[PDB]
């Protein structure tokens, strides 16, 4: 499924991401835009043998189990397939855990580059939340 900007903002707000670990809602919307382009089925294989899954591009070496990654940790205790669902619940619950690991939202490389220190609330502007 490919989400609309405001559609994802509403879904993310319903899953309690607004101000989660001190990050306003617009940071989450911006991160999904630059990570997966709002596509829940986005899958990106890396040269190291790991893959990034779903709307928030969650990594198979540390967070989810895809059974293909050497030295996998599965810190979110979920199959990587659960992160490709049209229902964002599993991706949100794992992102809540990732954001709590020592890096904050910097864990999402695209959030650091494109969203960190910008007017993130423009990503929720015009939405009927």
């Amino acid at each position, epitope marked *: 499924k490919v989400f609309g900007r405001c559609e994802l903002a509403a879904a993310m707000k319903r899953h309690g991401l607004d101000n989660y670990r001190g990050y306003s809602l617009g940071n989450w919307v911006c991160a999904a835009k630059f990570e997966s382009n709002f596509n829940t089925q986005a899958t990106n294989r890396n040269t190291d043998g790991s893959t990034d899954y779903g709307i928030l591009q969650i990594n198979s070496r540390w967070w989810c189990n895809d059974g293909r990654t050497p030295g996998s940790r599965n810190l979110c205790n979920i199959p990587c397939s659960a992160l490709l669902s049209s229902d964002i619940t599993a991706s949100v619950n794992c992102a809540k855990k990732i954001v709590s690991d*020592g*890096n904050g939202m910097n864990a999402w*490389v695209a959030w*650091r580059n494109r969203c960190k*220190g910008t007017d993130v609330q423009a990503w929720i502007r015009g939405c009927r939340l």
Partner: antibody
Amino acid sequence: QVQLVESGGGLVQPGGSLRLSCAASGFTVSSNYMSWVRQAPGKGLEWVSVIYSGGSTYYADSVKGRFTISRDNSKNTLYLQMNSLRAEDTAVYYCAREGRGDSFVYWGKGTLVTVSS
Amino acid sequence: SVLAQPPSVSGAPGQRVSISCTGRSSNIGAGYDVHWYQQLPGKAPKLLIYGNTNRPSGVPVRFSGSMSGTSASLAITGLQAEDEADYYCQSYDRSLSGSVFGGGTKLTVLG
């Protein structure tokens, strides 16, 4: 129009404490990413600490557990509380306002901190 | 080091010079953008290049950035006396959880 004025620097002895201030104008400290960067005499820039617009704080390993970054919204001021100061903490301390991706878009002129017995 | 730069670079007026920035898999190699700073003597650093290639207002076209893999570069064409300064590259390191600076490069304009 955007201005950062730091003060509070001076001489302190090893194990001593000092509090630096950074008075801002032309923007709101509370809704911005603010950082402290230091530079030891004739040395390179060293990132010290950051406070995110949402309140998250991060420190360099060298000052972890000794330095505390904080802000006062009414005074529109940024602080750096430095405790258990060591000789190697001697540097010009700069206050910086971050732009996109922790780029340091605006810098203050710096305040000197000397730690010596 | 977490970001390495040559301690010194020199060129003649009108020459093209480049300053390298070598990172690691936890910073530049992880995909984190490189920023560059120019520090004139007796002055605070000033942003020269942001997000690998962008020039802020007032930075001449003779200053350019490049970035691929674990490394980034700062190129200076038509070198002028006014370019003499200390240059620093900067990124983000996910292993250290914070912003990181290269050791700096002192640029000399010989001639």
